[PDB]
Enzyme design. Structure first.
Site, PDB file in Angstrom:
ATOM      1  N   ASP A  36       0.799  -1.231   0.000  1.00 30.29           N
ATOM      2  CA  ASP A  36       0.000   0.000   0.000  1.00 30.29           C
ATOM      3  C   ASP A  36       0.824   1.270   0.000  1.00 30.29           C
ATOM      4  O   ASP A  36       0.992   1.918  -1.027  1.00 30.29           O
ATOM      5  CB  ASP A  36      -0.934   0.090   1.209  1.00 30.29           C
ATOM      6  CG  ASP A  36      -2.268  -0.555   0.965  1.00 30.29           C
ATOM      7  OD1 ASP A  36      -2.815  -0.350  -0.135  1.00 30.29           O
ATOM      8  OD2 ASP A  36      -2.786  -1.244   1.872  1.00 30.29           O
ATOM      9  N   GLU A  75     -12.303   7.241  -0.595  1.00 33.10           N
ATOM     10  CA  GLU A  75     -12.148   7.060  -2.027  1.00 33.10           C
ATOM     11  C   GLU A  75     -13.388   7.461  -2.822  1.00 33.10           C
ATOM     12  O   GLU A  75     -13.919   6.679  -3.615  1.00 33.10           O
ATOM     13  CB  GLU A  75     -11.782   5.607  -2.295  1.00 33.10           C
ATOM     14  CG  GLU A  75     -10.671   5.115  -1.379  1.00 33.10           C
ATOM     15  CD  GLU A  75     -10.293   3.669  -1.615  1.00 33.10           C
ATOM     16  OE1 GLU A  75     -11.182   2.863  -1.954  1.00 33.10           O
ATOM     17  OE2 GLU A  75      -9.109   3.333  -1.444  1.00 33.10           O
ATOM     18  N   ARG A 134     -16.929   5.127  -0.673  1.00 36.30           N
ATOM     19  CA  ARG A 134     -16.816   3.819  -0.047  1.00 36.30           C
ATOM     20  C   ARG A 134     -16.909   3.866   1.481  1.00 36.30           C
ATOM     21  O   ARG A 134     -16.234   4.679   2.111  1.00 36.30           O
ATOM     22  CB  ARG A 134     -15.477   3.201  -0.447  1.00 36.30           C
ATOM     23  CG  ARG A 134     -14.985   2.080   0.439  1.00 36.30           C
ATOM     24  CD  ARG A 134     -13.572   1.717   0.022  1.00 36.30           C
ATOM     25  NE  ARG A 134     -12.988   0.653   0.825  1.00 36.30           N
ATOM     26  CZ  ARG A 134     -11.890  -0.016   0.479  1.00 36.30           C
ATOM     27  NH1 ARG A 134     -11.277   0.266  -0.667  1.00 36.30           N
ATOM     28  NH2 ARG A 134     -11.411  -0.980   1.270  1.00 36.30           N
ATOM     29  N   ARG A 167     -13.473  -9.337  -5.101  1.00 41.05           N
ATOM     30  CA  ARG A 167     -13.475  -8.420  -6.229  1.00 41.05           C
ATOM     31  C   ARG A 167     -13.392  -9.210  -7.527  1.00 41.05           C
ATOM     32  O   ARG A 167     -12.351  -9.271  -8.169  1.00 41.05           O
ATOM     33  CB  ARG A 167     -12.299  -7.442  -6.097  1.00 41.05           C
ATOM     34  CG  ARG A 167     -12.418  -6.590  -4.834  1.00 41.05           C
ATOM     35  CD  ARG A 167     -11.143  -5.845  -4.447  1.00 41.05           C
ATOM     36  NE  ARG A 167     -11.358  -5.110  -3.199  1.00 41.05           N
ATOM     37  CZ  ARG A 167     -10.515  -4.222  -2.677  1.00 41.05           C
ATOM     38  NH1 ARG A 167      -9.376  -3.945  -3.293  1.00 41.05           N
ATOM     39  NH2 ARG A 167     -10.816  -3.610  -1.537  1.00 41.05           N
ATOM     40  N   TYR A 205     -10.966  -1.942  -8.150  1.00 47.37           N
ATOM     41  CA  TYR A 205     -11.457  -0.571  -8.024  1.00 47.37           C
ATOM     42  C   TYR A 205     -12.175  -0.139  -9.289  1.00 47.37           C
ATOM     43  O   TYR A 205     -12.028  -0.750 -10.336  1.00 47.37           O
ATOM     44  CB  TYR A 205     -10.305   0.404  -7.773  1.00 47.37           C
ATOM     45  CG  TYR A 205      -9.928   0.583  -6.325  1.00 47.37           C
ATOM     46  CD1 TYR A 205     -10.250  -0.380  -5.376  1.00 47.37           C
ATOM     47  CD2 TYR A 205      -9.208   1.696  -5.914  1.00 47.37           C
ATOM     48  CE1 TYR A 205      -9.860  -0.237  -4.059  1.00 47.37           C
ATOM     49  CE2 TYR A 205      -8.819   1.847  -4.614  1.00 47.37           C
ATOM     50  CZ  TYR A 205      -9.144   0.877  -3.685  1.00 47.37           C
ATOM     51  OH  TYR A 205      -8.731   1.014  -2.382  1.00 47.37           O
TER      52      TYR A 205
HETATM   53  C1  LIG Z   1      -6.062   3.117   4.845  1.00 44.92           C
HETATM   54  C2  LIG Z   1      -7.473   2.744   4.520  1.00 44.92           C
HETATM   55  C3  LIG Z   1      -7.774   2.910   3.042  1.00 44.92           C
HETATM   56  C4  LIG Z   1      -9.293   3.104   2.777  1.00 44.92           C
HETATM   57  C5  LIG Z   1     -10.208   1.911   3.099  1.00 44.92           C
HETATM   58  O1  LIG Z   1      -7.103   1.758   2.384  1.00 44.92           O
HETATM   59  C6  LIG Z   1      -7.093   1.493   0.909  1.00 44.92           C
HETATM   60  C7  LIG Z   1      -7.764   0.192   0.557  1.00 44.92           C
HETATM   61  C8  LIG Z   1      -7.270  -0.612  -0.515  1.00 44.92           C
HETATM   62  C9  LIG Z   1      -7.940  -1.848  -0.846  1.00 44.92           C
HETATM   63  O2  LIG Z   1      -8.953  -2.181  -0.166  1.00 44.92           O
HETATM   64  O3  LIG Z   1      -7.533  -2.590  -1.799  1.00 44.92           O
HETATM   65  C10 LIG Z   1      -5.956  -0.085  -1.333  1.00 44.92           C
HETATM   66  C11 LIG Z   1      -5.537   1.437  -1.104  1.00 44.92           C
HETATM   67  N1  LIG Z   1      -4.186   1.628  -1.628  1.00 44.92           N
HETATM   68  C12 LIG Z   1      -5.603   1.731   0.394  1.00 44.92           C
HETATM   69  N2  LIG Z   1      -5.196   3.180   0.547  1.00 44.92           N
HETATM   70  C13 LIG Z   1      -4.211   3.536   1.395  1.00 44.92           C
HETATM   71  C14 LIG Z   1      -3.880   4.981   1.471  1.00 44.92           C
HETATM   72  O4  LIG Z   1      -3.559   2.728   2.120  1.00 44.92           O
END
Ligand SMILES: CCC(CC)O[C@@H]1C=C(C(=O)O)C[C@H](N)[C@H]1NC(C)=O
Ligand SMILES: CCC(CC)O[C@@H]1C=C(C(=O)O)C[C@H](N)[C@H]1NC(C)=O
Ligand SMILES: CCC(CC)O[C@@H]1C=C(C(=O)O)C[C@H](N)[C@H]1NC(C)=O
Ligand SMILES: CCC(CC)O[C@@H]1C=C(C(=O)O)C[C@H](N)[C@H]1NC(C)=O
Lengths: 385, 385, 385, 385
Positions: D69, D196, D211, D286, D320
């Site tokens: 991440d 997001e 989300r 997903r 996504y």
């Molecule tokens: C830190 C929580 C955040 C929102 C749910 O996580 C995301 C979820 C993700 C995921 O569920 O696949 C991937 C994103 N790269 C991540 N963003 C960050 C900045 O870490």
């Protein structure tokens, strides 16, 4: 607006390094075309590098016998100066195994020759679109400069040969406007031999120094007006310019027989009766390169000269070399600046590899001081093959 | 300003080589796309090469069964003419396993077909943005040109087929402006079969030469005015243009059944009652290529013709071939110049590789003289795999 | 229009990450240049990363002894900030093993030094064409900034050195217009040692913070007017900036002799009597990096400071660092924004590889808040070799 | 001129394929970055694809734990839609492990967050130059859209979150001009969770569907005027849009706690009381994607709907997805056109590889018909590793 070539060659004292592409060292891993016959030519805005590819990349099997010279896959492409020729940065120009090209101030003119040895055809293009054609008149390998052509007051000029690279052949000068042949003249040059001429514009007229592959160790020249009225001769200097060639001595205003039975493309700049000579350092192989200033060497016969500047060491491989210009409309200067490039040939026949290809380095006029040194290709052969 | 298309085809004597991408020989090591169905098309400023990728690279595993024709990863992309199609020099155009494209003087129009065989949808784009959509009306592989559409006075036209590649199917001509279908017509052509049409503008009208995959060895044609009023026929010449086809003999103005059960996309240029026919050299497989001038061959039934210009030897693979144009606004000429491109197919089903891809070469009209020769692909198969 | 340089450094509070190219992590597979001495410089429209290639690519045999510093294959090139330097995205600038560059608002000025140690020559270029030359006056490795030059009211200025990197040497400040040297001065700096200066424009004058490789743990500085009238000194802050250096303590406004017998390239921004100091975290090796705000450590001797902002943890390799500027004509601001870059050196002599190269990261001025962190190179050595 | 955002969303019947980059299939061999969180955004002239790289290429060792991440090597870059992201075709934008971006008619606005979880700072850039900074206000992973921000009448708006992805977090809306925050408001959303967000302009205001990673199976929303006066809610449809989610049933205009303790980024387009839902086909992972038209589904609670269009089969990985638009100044239309993209995630944690990356596909509104099908990634894992 069109490039006026009514200006004269800029006076200079030495040469300053302009570019080096390291295409062969890079191509060891990178996707770099296997090439030969490279040359620089500039517009009124930028300077490019043209070359004849082998339709293959270095270190790939298709690079195999790329020593053959003429093939259907040979193509003329270009990229900005100093960059390695890659399919990712090269502009396609034309299908060809022998070429030339120049910019008249408005658009680019490219000359690419393809086809069989008994009927090759020159396809002329202006700004990418075919504007004319010239078919072989002697049916024995119609070939051209392998260096830039010259434009003046909106007309560009080039030189072509047809016949034996072995003895008397036919020679022609062509004048063109918008990539169309408007006039041509065959040179009445018995006993002379013209090949791969390096032509530049000076005071509204063209001057070409070429290669005698038949029986000359010194280089032949041809100069002409915008009407193709011309003059011919050989550099009389005892500082022989071809390779192979004999040890320096007493030259002649005619073909020097001793060892000039083969050759290599070259160039020379004439100033009054003086000449800047670019040549290999060895007398037998295409090894090394140097610049020599022989005042009164264009008309006299003697091996004495004023200056010499090293470009590549005798221990390193060199190859073809050509001249290229910078016009006042690109430079802001009040004279036509002279520069030259050098091809650094690697592989066969000299090295035990399955391929042949080359790198490039270039320098320019300049009045400020310079230094001689060695800027060789640098690849370590053989390759992974 | 919009490309005017009121001028006539430029008169010509032969064909001058225009380009050669060498993509397959280059792709042995370089990151080159695996493709098929490549075609050339120009604007008033540049000429580009369009092609259908397989969303994979040469000499990579994803290159496997790339002989399948239709799949979700097939995409229509483009790059400048002569350059090898790669992800570092290719512009993405549309998701497609069948396409077409042309420039109207203002913006590019692209047509890409995707979706399932029983309900495909053509997506039309103008300057990169969707402007319309055409869904299958017979539910059986909606398909199109696989070469450039033709634009006249602001309107661009194309042809699509829906139904069996086997027998009688439905054919439609579409007329568009700024990428929107303003009108269409279904051809009332019983016993005809149209596919992969090569259409070109001439004197304000379009002329398409296509492929009969159902039962013809000679090629079918359709010409029509800007209101979609049309005429249909077959090239009557005894110099059969499809492949496969039978040895030359007595032609027909209707479908020549002998061997015409299959075919290959092709083109032809009409001049009065004469035609320039482009075809393979073999009568069975996609081998070699040649240009043939059969005056009075568009309406007459005889295998006699005037000139023959070799393009690709019988010993080498060829494939698809199409027509593409050079308008006055681009050229400066006062006539529409004819050019063509040839697809060089390597791999399955003729060679033992796990993939199928192609290289391209193109030529153009010209009054000056030319020469026949052989410009094949040049890659040696099989690859590292 | 020319970049007026009459504005002041913008008031700032910390530094915001501007870029990171991950060139090394990328080159493990990608065709990335092996490099050293990188630096950023901006024009009125874009910012580029300049650098000195080794004429080879990462993970290739030619990458061998790329620790050697000077060679004929060393070239100065550039690509947009943040992009990994590659032959497919790099513009060729000049043949050099030491360089400098800056934009005067109209065109790019490049300085590339090449040739032998006993006779190096600086090739200045304006818009790509050679405009002047400078030969070694002390015949002992003519060298320069290894970071951008500074331009003001149509004139650009740089600093060069000639003589021992071992003791008293000769330093000169040059003034150039359109790449032509119009004036030059030799600093009368006995007991000083200038090398690899980072110079920035401010209020119509130039300020340089350099490297004392002879006998200083603190850094020297030169500031001068547009007529080359100058002032010299050493940063007095007990927060020693050179590396190696001794632990922090009582500084000096002259050479701090302990440990300063070697060094690394750096920068510093003067604010009133205060300074923002960039430096490694290690006292012995080029490890880690951090920014420190010693308000008035420019003229005062005490190891106390206000703010510390981490840029790279001690556990990671760091290296050269230099200053670079934004101008009002690019930014639209009414002050000159300070920014800096950091070279992350991987390979020899600290790690067991056969090569040496580097990645880059950069930060910019800013008044809003910021945060320190660690943005190391991230490549894991050794490589496939 | 600035992008007026006064027009309304264009009426539509289905979705037409816009692009497919095949980045992973290609990356098997080519130099394609490894990435996640890709998204499309358009200016008045072109459409680009932004993405957060992992500072490494596919099939290289540095592509290892690219599932982490956040890291110092994460960077925001972009290339034209449809093209595979590579160091040869990608523009550098900012250093970030979380981003957003939009074009206001004049220049690009990019938003890149980096730094440690307890003090991350978003660096805003206008035309590539830093125009503002926003530091974390809760010290718990400041994060943002991971899609395009929306611009109206010269102002662009975005949404950011700071706090737990585990429960009640702090949400803020930012309004900016030329990249500078001119106003900001914190949402009074107790029991709500925003992350997001996908925001689109409509009739001069902004609408976001985000989300809920805390406790919601359905998607939360926020709409607001140009003075940040807002309204919040949850999509009421029993056609749950988050993943994971329970089987379809009775929805709720508030958080649906069953199974929404995690989620995935998504979007939706509201037309009156109806909504176009984009979602995975699977309720646990997903897998697959599809568009659904539920008239009166934004305000009502039932699982019934009128139209369903397949985009990705349940047998293939999706991920996504977000919204993006094409304004009248780009399209020429008189309404704001709706489009969307889908990230096709391959590798970890669902597949046994050492890496994680994604491919993209996109679609656009359209009046004409369309068709459902499956356009998956198509890469075959595992890779050479
Ligand atoms: C830190 C929580 C955040 C929102 C749910 O996580 C995301 C979820 C993700 C995921 O569920 O696949 C991937 C994103 N790269 C991540 N963003 C960050 C900045 O870490
Ligand atoms: C055909 C004779 C010609 C002039 C000497 O040969 C050249 C010599 C060459 C050489 O001596 O290295 C290489 C050139 N590629 C070749 N030109 C062509 C067209 O084959
Ligand atoms: C579906 C019939 C159609 C017309 C003959 O087949 C073509 C023939 C081909 C061929 O003969 O090589 C290749 C084309 N890719 C294919 N078109 C499609 C859409 O799959
Ligand atoms: C010649 C002395 C000079 C200044 C200390 O050396 C530099 C130090 C370097 C270093 O300390 O890492 C690397 C530079 N490539 C080198 N420059 C040249 C021209 O060799």
């Amino acid at each position: 607006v069109k490039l006026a070539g009514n200006s004269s060659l800029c006076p200079i004292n030495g040469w300053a390094v302009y570019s080096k592409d390291n295409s062969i060292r890079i191509g060891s891993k990178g996707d770099v075309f296997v090439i030969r016959e490279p040359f620089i030519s500039c517009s009124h805005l930028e300077c490019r590098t043209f070359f004849l590819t082998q339709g293959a990349l270095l270190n790939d099997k298709h690079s195999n016998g790329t020593v053959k010279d003429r093939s259907p896959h040979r193509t003329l492409m270009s990229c900005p100066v100093g960059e390695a020729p890659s399919p990712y940065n090269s502009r396609f120009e034309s299908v060809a195994w022998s070429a030339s090209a120049c910019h008249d101030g408005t658009s680019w003119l490219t000359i690419g020759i393809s086809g069989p040895d008994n009927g090759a055809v020159a396809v002329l293009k202006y700004n990418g679109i075919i504007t004319d054609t010239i078919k072989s008149w002697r049916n024995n390998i119609l070939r051209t400069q392998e260096s830039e052509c010259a434009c003046v007051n909106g007309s560009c000029f080039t030189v072509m040969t047809d016949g034996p690279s072995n003895g008397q052949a036919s020679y022609k000068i062509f004048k063109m406007e918008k990539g169309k042949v408007v006039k041509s003249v065959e040179l009445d040059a018995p006993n002379y031999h013209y090949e791969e001429c390096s032509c530049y514009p000076n005071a509204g007229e063209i001057t070409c120094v070429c290669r005698d592959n038949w029986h000359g160790s010194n280089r032949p020249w041809v100069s002409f007006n915008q009407n193709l009225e011309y003059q011919i001769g050989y550099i009389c200097s005892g500082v022989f310019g071809d390779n192979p060639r004999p040890n320096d001595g007493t030259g002649s205003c005619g073909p020097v027989s001793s060892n000039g039975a083969y050759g290599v493309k070259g160039f020379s700049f004439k100033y009054g009766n003086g000449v800047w000579i670019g040549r290999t350092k060895s007398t037998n192989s295409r090894s090394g390169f140097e610049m020599i200033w022989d005042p009164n060497g264009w008309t006299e016969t003697d091996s004495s000269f004023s200056v010499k500047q090293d470009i590549v060491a005798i221990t390193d491989w060199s190859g073809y070399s050509g001249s290229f210009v910078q016009h006042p409309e690109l430079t802001g200067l009040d004279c036509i600046r002279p520069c030259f490039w050098v091809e650094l040939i690697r592989g066969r026949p000299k090295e035990s590899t399955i391929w042949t290809s080359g790198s490039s380095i270039s320098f320019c006029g300049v009045n400020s001081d310079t230094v001689g040194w060695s800027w060789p290709d640098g690849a370590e052969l053989p390759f992974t093959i």
